[PDB]
Design an enzyme around this catalytic site. Structure first.
Site, PDB file in Angstrom:
ATOM      1  N   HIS B  41       0.805  -1.213   0.000  1.00 26.92           N
ATOM      2  CA  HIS B  41       0.000   0.000   0.000  1.00 26.92           C
ATOM      3  C   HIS B  41       0.842   1.269   0.000  1.00 26.92           C
ATOM      4  O   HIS B  41       0.277   2.367   0.033  1.00 26.92           O
ATOM      5  CB  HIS B  41      -0.981  -0.027   1.185  1.00 26.92           C
ATOM      6  CG  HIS B  41      -0.401   0.417   2.496  1.00 26.92           C
ATOM      7  ND1 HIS B  41      -0.395  -0.395   3.610  1.00 26.92           N
ATOM      8  CD2 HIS B  41       0.127   1.600   2.894  1.00 26.92           C
ATOM      9  CE1 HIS B  41       0.147   0.255   4.625  1.00 26.92           C
ATOM     10  NE2 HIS B  41       0.474   1.467   4.216  1.00 26.92           N
ATOM     11  N   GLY B 143       2.745   5.932  10.111  1.00 28.75           N
ATOM     12  CA  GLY B 143       4.007   5.656   9.456  1.00 28.75           C
ATOM     13  C   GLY B 143       4.775   4.472   9.994  1.00 28.75           C
ATOM     14  O   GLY B 143       5.965   4.335   9.686  1.00 28.75           O
ATOM     15  N   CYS B 145       3.903   1.377   9.264  1.00 23.32           N
ATOM     16  CA  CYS B 145       3.664   0.264   8.356  1.00 23.32           C
ATOM     17  C   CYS B 145       4.986  -0.289   7.841  1.00 23.32           C
ATOM     18  O   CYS B 145       5.909   0.461   7.513  1.00 23.32           O
ATOM     19  CB  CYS B 145       2.787   0.714   7.188  1.00 23.32           C
ATOM     20  SG  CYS B 145       1.235   1.491   7.690  1.00 23.32           S
TER      21      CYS B 145
END
Lengths: 306, 306
Positions: B41, B143, B145
């Protein structure tokens, strides 16, 4: 976004954990520059713990009597000295993995990350706190002496703790990196009173602020207290007295969340006298006290250390 | 000697955490050999989370549209592919800090250590568990991820988790390192039912054994149950059914401590129906479930990982 007992990344410390063996006893050392720091009781034996004459015992020891082992490269000592309760062994080579470092004597209520080691090899890392009676509860098995606690200020590793002994009460004691013990503890195996332990009130309030940021707000009320009123409740439950300095440290959390500090205190006052009534606060039905207000800010802002 | 939620030493993983930025979005990558693994993503935008056509979105992306940054040495990508919900970006150079590694799809109830990262830089490490509904509660800010969960088998790092998204319920979901999500979760921002969550009963019993080793034994009783009797109590309190395999995994703890497994079960049966009555079990008044029987053995024996 959730909240947890976070531990600093231990990579910069793993490269300094060495194994120090002096005759009979083996334990862990800290290899910074060309020096190895280790607990001074490595030169003792089993019976020597009852009453050790460290100055006379060290005199019997020579340089070659000290075997320092970093993984599989063995280090040549060429100098030794006893600073308080630790050893300083000058070695042949500088540690090429040495980080930027500060030796710091921390205060009670402060937190730090401990890297548990055995025969000089890392095992695990966790966050603990220097309790007001200068003890830390620990996970220190046989041979974990020399494990270091530390904080990391962005790029610098602040060494604060070195684990020495274990009390008969089950909790643990240690020194700074200059050898001075935290608290009244000495490195011998005798009855050593831990002293009464209270709860770090500043840590409990900052923990409540973090819970407000992460969902749980059932404890929020529209009752207050004064600083003197909350204090009379604090010592009845063995909590630290709250100074105005403790209010000011909670300032940033007080502003970002919009609940005054004394409003949080009356929520704590209500939690002391009525318990939790089955409910929890971020997966715990106990008043957590191992989170400094600074720790809450790092976890809610996202401060990095590299 | 004490017991704690221990996290693996994160040194071997810190050297692989890179920063992957594709146009708008920045997140963390995992740099092993000459490949960077990151959540797929990263190629989306804010609005794209509602419904992303990842195959068409990736087609619009070229190699130079991917900026991988390891500290201050920027990596040249020369190949890209989409394996399930992750990206595979071949880069110019092998990671010289690559450790021995295994990609593993772990099971519910298993534990692992998570290294929280932001813009490719480490922030903290902690131990969590894959809950039966394939969720993990997390401390994942904006942030985070691409953060990875992992175990360490003596010398090998077993990569199992990569954090993708955060559910509206507050808990988190992710994939293995081959991109397949744990549970029914997909990488889009929609209402995603977490499903009912039970308590890992095997972990609770092994946690009780650890407490017997470390002082607390007030819950020990001289009442029993049968496997079927304890099971009828377990589902009434939303506990996992206990198979004979779960009894056999607890075998080593059962022998070293001298309390039969079913004896521990009746202590748990008594703790479910009567609570804890003010008392605690190793500093906690809750039935901890994030300790596997293997984790208890490492902490009580002292297994090292280097």
């Amino acid at each position: 976004s959730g909240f947890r007992k976070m531990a600093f990344p231990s990579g910069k410390v793993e490269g300094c954990m060495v194994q120090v063996t002096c005759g009979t006893t083996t334990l862990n050392g800290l290899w910074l520059d060309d020096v190895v720091y280790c607990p001074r009781h490595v030169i003792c034996t089993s019976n020597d713990m009852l009453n050790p004459n460290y100055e006379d015992l060290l005199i019997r020891k020579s340089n070659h009597n000290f075997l320092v082992q970093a993984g599989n490269v063995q280090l040549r000592v060429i100098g030794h000295s006893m600073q308080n309760c630790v050893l300083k062994l000058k070695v042949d080579t500088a540690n090429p993995k040495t980080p930027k470092y500060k030796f710091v004597r921390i205060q009670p209520g402060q937190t730090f990350s401990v890297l548990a080691c055995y025969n000089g090899s890392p095992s695990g890392v966790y966050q603990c706190a220097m309790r007001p009676n200068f003890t830390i509860k620990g996970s220190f098995l046989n041979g974990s002496c020399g494990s270091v606690g530390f904080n990391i200020d962005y790029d610098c590793v602040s060494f604060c703790y070195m684990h020495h002994m274990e009390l008969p009460t089950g909790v643990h004691a240690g020194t700074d990196l200059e050898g001075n013990f935290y608290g009244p503890f000495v490195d011998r195996q005798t009855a050593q009173a831990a002293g009464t332990d209270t709860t770090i009130t500043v840590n409990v309030l900052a923990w409540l602020y973090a819970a407000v940021i992460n969902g749980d707000r059932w404890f929020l009320n529209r009752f207050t207290t004064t600083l003197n009123d909350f204090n009379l409740v604090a010592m009845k439950y063995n909590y630290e007295p709250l100074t105005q300095d403790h209010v000011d440290i909670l300032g940033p959390l007080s502003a970002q969340t919009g609940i005054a500090v004394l409003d949080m205190c009356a929520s704590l006052k209500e939690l002391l006298q009525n318990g939790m009534n089955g409910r929890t606060i971020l997966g715990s039905a106990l008043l957590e006290d191992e989170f400094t207000p600074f720790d809450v800010v790092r976890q809610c802002s996202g401060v990095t250390f590299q």
